């Protein structure tokens, strides 16, 4: 478990239907919302690949060994019942294990992709801002809507505001 | 000055199947499903006994083709397709159970 979905992000954004991992900003212009394409597409592709590998099954042909309209010998019938009930229990246990493990892995994979996008945005905002902890980024100088898109487009340059941030933090 | 980090790779990668990706490229990998065997019966270290044209029933009843195998000791009994059990024509009641009992045994 990573500290993103069940950790420092103590609240989800139900109003963010644009994607699974998006940005919400508040600048002098006002409040705005967008979504990151890369992480959302990665999660969607992984989940769809899981589902695709899951739903495919050739299911080798089987035939009837027990008669439905006549009586079977008692001993061989008991043997068949025992075998089929054992197979049922085995498949039930494997189904439980597969479902539980796959759900855990899907949730933790969404969490990992969230944290990876977080680290990407941090590597972009390397030396011009600070992270308050609750998923937000306390920008120390400013950021325009075009600056926000540059953060989305992964084109934000920190050497352009480095000296500005240093002078604002010192004075 | 500058120092970078990275991993290695190969030109001809190996494709493996995962939970999220059906075709994932990795380095030199290993096959887990065997597809080739040896067309021989490796009996070194095993006191084998080849019945040849002798059938397990002929060892108990004493057919001519089993005169070489009326008695003996072995840890592995080998039966052949041309195994003759009857010189005089006939059949055996519950022949499968007796054949299993004989092939499971290690001496007569």
């Amino acid at each position, epitope marked *: 478990l990573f500290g993103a979905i069940a950790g420092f992000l103590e609240n989800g954004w139900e109003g963010m239907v644009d*994607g699974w991992y998006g940005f919400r900003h508040q600048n002098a212009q006002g409040t705005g919302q967008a*979504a990151d*394409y890369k992480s*959302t597409q990665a999660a969607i592709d992984q989940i769809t*690949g899981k*589902l695709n590998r899951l739903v495919e099954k050739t299911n080798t042909e089987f035939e009837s060994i027990e008669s439905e309209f006549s009586e079977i010998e008692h001993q061989i019938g008991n043997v068949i019942n025992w075998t089929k009930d054992s197979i049922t229990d085995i498949w039930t246990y494997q189904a439980e294990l597969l479902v539980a493990m796959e759900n855990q892995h899907t949730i933790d994979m969404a969490d990992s992709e969230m944290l990876n996008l977080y680290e990407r945005v941090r590597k972009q905002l390397r030396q011009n801002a600070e992270e308050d902890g609750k998923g937000c980024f306390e920008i120390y100088h400013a950021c325009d809507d075009s600056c926000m898109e540059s953060i989305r487009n992964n084109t934000y340059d920190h050497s352009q505001y480095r000296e500005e941030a240093l002078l604002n933090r010192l004075n | 000055d500058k120092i970078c980090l990275g991993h290695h790779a190969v030109a001809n990668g190996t494709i493996v199947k995962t939970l999220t990706n059906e*075709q994932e*490229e990795v380095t030199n990998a290993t096959e887990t499903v065997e597809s080739t065997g040896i067309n021989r019966l490796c009996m070194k270290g095993r006191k084998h006994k080849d019945l040849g044209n002798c059938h397990p029933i002929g060892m108990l009843i004493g057919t001519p083709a089993c005169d070489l195998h009326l008695t003996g000791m072995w840890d592995t009994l080998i039966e052949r397709e041309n195994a003759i059990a009857y010189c005089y024509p006939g059949a055996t009641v519950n022949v499968e159970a007796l054949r299993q009992k004989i092939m499971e045994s290690g001496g007569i």
Partner: antibody
Amino acid sequence: QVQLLESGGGVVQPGRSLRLSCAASGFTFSNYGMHWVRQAPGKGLEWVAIISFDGSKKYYANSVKGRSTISRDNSKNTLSLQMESLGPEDTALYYCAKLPSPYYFDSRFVWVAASAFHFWGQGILVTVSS
Amino acid sequence: MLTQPPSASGTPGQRVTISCSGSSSNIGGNTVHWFQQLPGTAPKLLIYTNSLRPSGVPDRFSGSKSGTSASLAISGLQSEDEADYYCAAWDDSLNGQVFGGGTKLTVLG
């Protein structure tokens, strides 16, 4: 399930405008982002236009950018395309279809699915000449 | 604009492969797609997300993606699979889907 209707075909002279319109049924059209593609006679595939499920952005192809216009209406479940100045490079078969596209061009209801709703129906075969 | 290897050849049950290369603007980084056009009829979707298949595709077909190059493989091909096969992918700079040239394959008769 897979049943459609297409209109706008015929013989249009060069210089005038072509207007094509396809309407599908058997599913919820108001969610799938649709695509218009063209194929010149013979072989060769060239994409024309894409549209969001609500019509937010078009992002036309550079070959016909600023010259064509794609539009959609989710009430009547229809997708239309209008193009002007039809040179000989526009005589082709125009397919309206649902292709695997970016996720926000589709709706959140079909993200969690491995169905991969497939299409491409029939053709149109627009021709421009005397 | 993607690469256009025009033709591939093989025999029934030979596992022929068709390649589709490009740049980071189209391949990436991004997902590619594959389609099958039977001679005289409409295309049918075969591969999406570079390894996934829709309902009506037998498991004999398979797709891949190696870095900036993709490939298409057909294991159990027979006489009823001689058709046209094209490549497709979404372009990053060009905000749309850019395709390949195409491939016309024919079995060794």
